[PDB]
Design a protein around this ligand. Structure first.
Ligand code: HEM
Length: 292
């Protein structure tokens, strides 16, 4: 294969997208009670990831382009349990700005969330185009959590991600938490659940982890601070290549920020062809920078 060519929403420029960014950012600030005062930031990051992470480099199916999460087949993927709360948050935004494509809106939600939680700037490109219901990918393309480093590595090859990209992207588990009813895992990865930092790598290295079984009969790694790691998270310190990179990001916040920003942009852009006459990527100002 498919070719997906980016097409700018008719007549729109930087100023129109910054308005949508601001609407999202303001609502994140306002609807702050969700999930015991974590807010909607983490679920929006997860949503941008799950809508992008269906991509397959072999035939160019899936990915962020088509916005196919709106269709029932993908919406009801058991892997997507809990993301309805992100979709509902974005629905009134989409009504206020009905000219934005679904894929642009889901991806921009992730960018906005990261920046407003004090993460790196993520350059973002517009032009995703809604595609028909029969372009929805089948369930099963998102990863399982009960596997090891070899599975993680192999899985991310399908998205054209290398070891450094994978380790960088996984740092997003600083954000939010697992929810028993959604995934069969329970607890947060850290203390500051709605601030983007390199805390995931710090906790992985410095906590004393014990293999326990949770109320859904799944194994997870638990620490005495009250944190948890999935088996896929913990595997990053079992594999010697991953461990070297985990140590790097634990000791250099700025490098983690830069590498995350590139890998996350790539994730969101996988499968899309941008014409040479396409506008350059936008960098949005945060509310804080606008004095808002
Ligand atoms: C091996 C790859 C991954 C696995 C197996 C995995 C698995 C999971 C699971 C099971 C949850 C809990 C869902 C719930 O109970 O609500 C979760 C949450 C989350 N994931 Fe991952 N994930 C992976 C990679 C990623 C990536 C690559 C990103 C973003 C770049 C990401 C961002 C998040 C965030 C922000 C949450 C918190 C959501 C919330 O608080 O509602 N994850 N992940």
């Amino acid at each position: 294969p498919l070719v997906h060519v980016a097409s700018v929403e008719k007549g729109r420029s930087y100023e129109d997208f910054q308005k949508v960014y601001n609407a999202i950012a303001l609502k994140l600030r306002e609807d702050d009670e969700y999930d015991n005062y974590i807010g909607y930031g983490p679920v929006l990051v997860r949503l941008a990831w799950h809508t992008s992470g269906t991509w397959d480099k072999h035939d160019n199916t899936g990915g962020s382009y088509g916005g196919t999460y709106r269709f029932k087949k993908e919406f009801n993927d058991p892997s997507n349990a809990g993301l309805q709360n992100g979709f509902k948050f974005l629905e009134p935004i989409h009504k206020e700005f009905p000219w934005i494509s679904s894929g642009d809106l889901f991806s921009l939600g992730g960018v906005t969330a990261v920046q407003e939680m004090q993460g790196p700037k993520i350059p973002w490109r517009c032009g995703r185009v809604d595609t028909p219901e029969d372009t929805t990918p089948d369930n099963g393309r998102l990863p399982d959590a009960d596997k090891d480093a070899d599975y993680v590595r192999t899985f991310f090859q399908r998205l054209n991600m290398n070891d450094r990209e994978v380790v960088a992207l996984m740092g997003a588990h600083a954000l939010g938490k697992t929810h028993l009813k959604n995934s069969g895992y329970e607890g947060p990865w850290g203390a500051a659940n709605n601030v983007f930092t390199n805390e995931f790598y710090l906790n992985l290295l410095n906590e004393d982890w014990k293999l326990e079984k949770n109320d859904a009969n799944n194994e997870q790694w638990d620490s005495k601070s009250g944190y948890m790691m999935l088996p896929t998270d913990y595997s990053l310190i079992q594999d010697p290549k991953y461990l070297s990179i985990v140590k790097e990001y634990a000791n250099d916040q700025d490098k983690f920020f830069k590498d995350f920003s590139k890998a996350f942009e790539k994730l969101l852009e996988n499968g899309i062809t941008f014409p040479k006459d396409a506008p350059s990527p936008f960098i949005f100002k945060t509310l804080e920078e606008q004095g808002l």
